[PDB]
Amino acid sequence: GPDRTCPAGQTYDRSVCYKYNTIRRFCVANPRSNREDIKNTPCRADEICVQRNLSNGKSFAQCIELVK
Numbered sequence: 001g002p003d004r005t006c007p008a009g010q011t012y013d014r015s016v017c018y019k020y021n022t023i024r025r026f027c028v029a030n031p032r033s034n035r036e037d038i039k040n041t042p043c044r045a046d047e048i049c050v051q052r053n054l055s056n057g058k059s060f061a062q063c064i065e066l067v068k
Contacts, residue, residue: 006037012057013037017049023063 006013006027013027023041043049043063051061 003037006035008035014053014057014059015051015061016053016059017051017061019044021047021049023049023051023061025061 005011006029008029011027011029013025015023015025018024021044023043025039025041027037027039029035041063046066046068047063048066049061049063051059053059
């Protein structure tokens with residue numbers, strides 16, 4: 001039911017950390033100009049971002065709240 005990831009066989013979805021604080025996720029089916037799922041997590045105040053890129057179109061990033 002819920003829409004997750006980008007269907008249609010194999011797809012490339014990678015995420016990057018903007019400003020080493022904010023998390024941005026980019027998901028594309030393949031054409032990169034038809035159906036894309038983009039998510040944005042506004043992390044910056046007392047929040048840390050961790051990303052892992054396989055350089056193969058597959059990357060996973062997560063935002064974790066960090067406190068003093």
